Amino acid sequence: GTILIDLSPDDKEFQSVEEEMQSTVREHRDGGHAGGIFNRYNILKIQKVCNKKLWERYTHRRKEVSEENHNHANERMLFHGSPFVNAIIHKGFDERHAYIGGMFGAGIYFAENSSKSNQYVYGIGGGTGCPVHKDRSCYICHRQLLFCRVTLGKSFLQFSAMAHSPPGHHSVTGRPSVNGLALAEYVIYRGEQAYPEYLITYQIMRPE
Ligand SMILES: Cc1cc(=O)[nH]c2cc(-c3ccc(C(=O)O)cc3Cl)ccc12
Ligand SMILES: [Zn+2]
Secondary structure, three states: OOEEEEOOOOOHHHHHHHHHHHHOOOOOOOOOOOOOOOOOEEEEEEEEEEOHHHHHHHHHHHHHHHHOOOOOOOEEEEEEOOOOHHHHHHHOOOHHHOEOOOOOOOEEEEEOOHHHHHOOOOOHHHOOOOOOOOOOOOOOOOEEEEEEEEEOOOEEEEEEOOOOOOOOOOEEEEEEOOOOOOOOEEEEOOHHHEEEEEEEEEEEOOOO
């Protein structure tokens, strides 16, 4: 029962979501290997993802976390890129989407930097790039990211040199320690702690 509603570029909701995507682009230490070389995106569309069942599943978990955490869900809006984006908007996040080899544990990963999530749209490491051209820096093919509502609850703070959550925690916060430009990443262990609120379709832009 998911329906996608197109936002008009003239709508303030479109404009705030586009500004979060654009303003959280950073340079990556791979020189663009995984996600391509760019400083900004061309946003083609932003759709609101509406699924009553998935939304209730998310608010039900959010109330349980918030009750375990002095009435504080610690809810954030974060990006998630994956080849499974079509399945996530219809069926929700789940364990099948956990990153088994993730540095901060086997869970589902979200990013503050949209350009970190862009690195994963075509798979771990950028996979083989776009399906059409096999190009991880393709400027033609349309990519998609989710901008998601995520319940962190009590988050374990892991400093990083760039399964279940640690006992008594509802998530993990991956704090960069070496690149003072990198924003945080977060990992959750139950799919019902994230709701894919917006589906953003875009291209990366070749720098001038
Ligand atoms: C760090 C991070 C940020 C993000 O926005 N998205 C991701 C997605 C995956 C991921 C996990 C499993 C698989 C697969 O089973 O094939 C694929 C991917 Cl892309 C892993 C990590 C991230
Ligand atoms: Zn392509």
